[PDB]
């Protein structure tokens, strides 16, 4: 049977914290995208289109690592695609068919598979409009009819007859970090007016969430493509507490990253508390999302690292608050 | 004179106006004051509920000049926030004065200098035009005086007295009498 | 910058002699002469992103020597 | 005049010449002390303190003067903003260009070798016109800024107020030796 959109989240759950909304339409799009895909396909039965979702997030707040989180469990071919390589038809670079390619190689090229696969397109934000405009609006204009159902004449197995892909029922998501949309959304909710007569208004995660088309259109995106992005979620901007559990709870946390590089080693790494909040708010501050976790992580075990593959019978290693906040060595316990 | 540039590229007004600070420097001219009610419109809108600052070091000049500065500063929403530097006299020191209650300020070596209006304009003429010219000086008069002791929370007659020649004041005094409500030090 | 984005974390490059590349487990040294981030200031991203470098490959270069 | 045009190597950005230096936290107060002159002082100190509270600013004097309310602008922002304004005289620091001097933080007022500091009582603030009652007034306006800047002088230097109301009788010419001596200034550079 098929799991339920909870269980997709619970999945997602194992490795990334916070986004319970981009979490929530991931799942349930894979699940009506299941349904569609054991639904009848001829007789009196209504057909089914797909909705296709887009996530709108800052930086480090998790939308790749959804996407790959999903993947873990999907039972249909799925493919990490990357729009900065993407250039119109007559032009150096790679074609919008060149996705259908790659979903089709992760299948062996059973095409019946690829076609109920689901594409990731990373850096979408990136063909936006701000001549011909080749890497950018091209782009769009030529992966519309590849979201929308047509049939991609993609090359062979071999070397260089072509195969042909029906992309009418392959989901397609999209998602990239529209750094500059948060000016447009404000001088749209905040507009007022100058001078007597006129009145004038009041003055990251609230200004996602308010996304309107209109936004997307005034940062770049042209509307024939956003009306095939029927689902817009968003990722808010990850703060002091959610930086925390990011060190810790997930499957692959990055302070249990570190305490397997020490257990090929036989000391034991050990984080109070204090240092995993410093930790969290130094990381903040950096403006990089959960990434700059690592920086800090990295910098205050660099000597530490550095000395003990040598140290003879070092058992634990503490790194307490002082170690962040200030130029100190770990407790060594031999 | 040369304004320096900061960095976009401003000069370095337009880099203060970025901060909600609007400069009266030198006398009240139509010409300056349009400009300070021009920054005001604009700041409102920019954000209405944020204090502007208005810098004021001026010897004086025209009432009605100064009357849209006054008015505009009463209209817009955002409190007027006033500084005296160097000097604020004559309708300098209303406009001091004139800043939102609690938000009117003076560096501590500030001179702030109150009187009656002088000529609003030349009395030539008929003596039937120099009479309509000194009725009109005199509601002038009353009107600066009235609207500087509500200013100021003093009886209309203790501005007629203090404004009869000019007055001149210390941060201190100044803020004793009620011109302003507190002195800048750090 | 936004190209070199996906390569220098987990991509799969399509690279001639076609070769399919994981370049997940490819170790990126990154580096130059930032002299304009001497004036900018113990670097830290603020001082590259005022340099000129866009957030998203900062944070993919966690390290900096 | 023509300010020359300098090149900064960040990219690159062109700056006047004063620009440039106001970059490096340098203020010129150049000439005759006038409302205008002074705020746009006062408009640099104010701009340096928000690009860097911490750090010092340089205020170099070449002036003979000027209006002493213009002086008091820029007398109140130097020692209102946080960061050290440290002020070096060149030419000259006549009257309020020596008032202004003497106001930089102490242990950071220097000097020329060649410069050439003058502190006087105060002329005219504005004329003393009208009726003997308006006369009375300004002269008794004159007096007290005249006391004042004595006051803040003879603070500025270490001094008793005796001394410098001797001492600004008249115009009272100082080499940067003897302004260093006085106490105007702390130091007197060479190289
Ligand atoms: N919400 C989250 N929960 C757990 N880990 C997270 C979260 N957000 C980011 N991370 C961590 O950040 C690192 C990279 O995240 P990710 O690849 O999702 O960023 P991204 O979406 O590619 O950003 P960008 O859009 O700038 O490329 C991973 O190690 C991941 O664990
Ligand atoms: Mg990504």
Do not use: C, W
């Given at each position: 049977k098929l799991p339920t959109?909870?269980?997709?989240?619970?999945?997602?759950?194992?490795?990334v914290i916070g986004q319970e909304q981009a979490k929530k339409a991931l799942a349930v799009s894979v699940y009506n995208h299941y349904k569609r895909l054991r639904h009848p396909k001829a007789g009196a039965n209504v057909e089914l289109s797909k909705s296709?979702?887009?996530?709108?997030?800052?930086?480090?707040?998790?939308?790749?690592?959804?996407?790959?989180?999903?993947?873990?469990?999907?039972?249909?071919?799925?493919?990490?695609?990357?729009?900065?390589?993407?250039?119109e038809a007559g032009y150096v670079g790679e074609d919008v068919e060149q996705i259908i390619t790659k979903l089709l190689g992760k299948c062996d090229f059973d095409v019946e598979k690829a076609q109920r696969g689901i594409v990731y397109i990373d850096q979408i934000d990136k063909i936006s409009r701000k001549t011909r405009d080749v890497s950018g609006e091209g782009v769009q204009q030529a992966l519309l009819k590849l979201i929308e159902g047509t049939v991609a004449s993609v090359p062979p197995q071999g070397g260089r007859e072509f195969i042909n892909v029906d992309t009418t029922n392959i989901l397609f998501i999209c998602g990239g970090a529209f750094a500059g949309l948060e000016k447009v959304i404000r001088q749209r909710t905040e507009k007022?007016?100058?001078?007597?007569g006129a009145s004038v208004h009041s003055k990251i995660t609230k200004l996602f969430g308010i996304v309107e088309p209109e936004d997307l259109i005034k940062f770049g995106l042209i509307p024939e493509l956003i009306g095939r992005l029927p689902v817009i979620a968003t990722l808010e901007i990850l703060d002091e507490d959610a930086l925390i559990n990011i060190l810790t709870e997930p499957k692959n946390a990055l302070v249990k990253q570190y305490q397997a590089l020490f257990g090929?080693?036989?000391?034991?790494?050990?984080?109070?508390?204090?240092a995993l909040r410093s930790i969290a708010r130094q990381a903040?501050?950096?403006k990089t999302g959960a990434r700059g976790l690592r920086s800090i992580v990295e910098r205050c075990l660099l000597d530490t690292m550095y000395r003990l593959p040598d140290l003879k019978g070092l058992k634990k290693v503490v790194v307490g608050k002082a170690v962040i906040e200030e130029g100190r060595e770990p407790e060594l316990v031999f | 004179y040369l304004v320096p540039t900061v960095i976009r590229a401003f000069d370095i007004y337009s880099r203060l106006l970025k901060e909600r600070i609007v400069f009266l420097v030198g006398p009240v001219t139509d010409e300056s004051a349009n400009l300070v009610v021009a920054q005001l419109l604009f700041?409102?809108?920019?954000?209405?509920?944020?204090?502007?600052?208005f810098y004021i070091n001026s010897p004086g000049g025209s009432v009605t000049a100064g009357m849209s500065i006054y008015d505009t500063m009463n209209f817009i929403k955002p409190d007027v926030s006033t500084l005296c530097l160097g000097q604020a006299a004559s309708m300098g020191a209303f406009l001091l004065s004139a800043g939102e209650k609690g938000k009117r300020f003076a560096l501590p070596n500030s001179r702030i200098m109150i009187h009656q209006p002088l000529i609003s304009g030349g009395l030539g003429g008929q003596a039937s035009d120099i009479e309509?010219?000194?009725?009109?000086?005199?509601?002038?008069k009353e009107k600066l005086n009235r609207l500087m002791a509500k200013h100021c929370d003093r009886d209309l007659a203790d501005?007629?007295?203090?404004?009869?020649?000019?007055?001149?004041?210390?941060?201190?005094?100044?803020?004793?009498?009620?011109?302003?409500?507190?002195?800048?030090?750090?």
């Open positions: 959109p909870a269980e997709i989240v619970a999945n997602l759950n194992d490795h296709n979702i887009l996530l709108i997030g800052p930086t480090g707040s998790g939308k790749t690592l959804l996407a790959q989180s999903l993947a873990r469990k999907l039972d249909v071919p799925f493919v990490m695609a990357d729009a900065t390589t993407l250039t007022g007016g100058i001078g007597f090929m080693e036989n000391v034991e790494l050990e984080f109070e508390e204090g903040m501050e950096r | 700041l409102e809108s920019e954000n209405p509920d944020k204090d502007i600052f309509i010219h000194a009725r009109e000086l005199l509601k002038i501005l007629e007295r203090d404004t009869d020649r000019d007055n001149f004041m210390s941060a201190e005094e100044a803020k004793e009498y009620g011109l302003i409500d507190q002195i800048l030090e750090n």
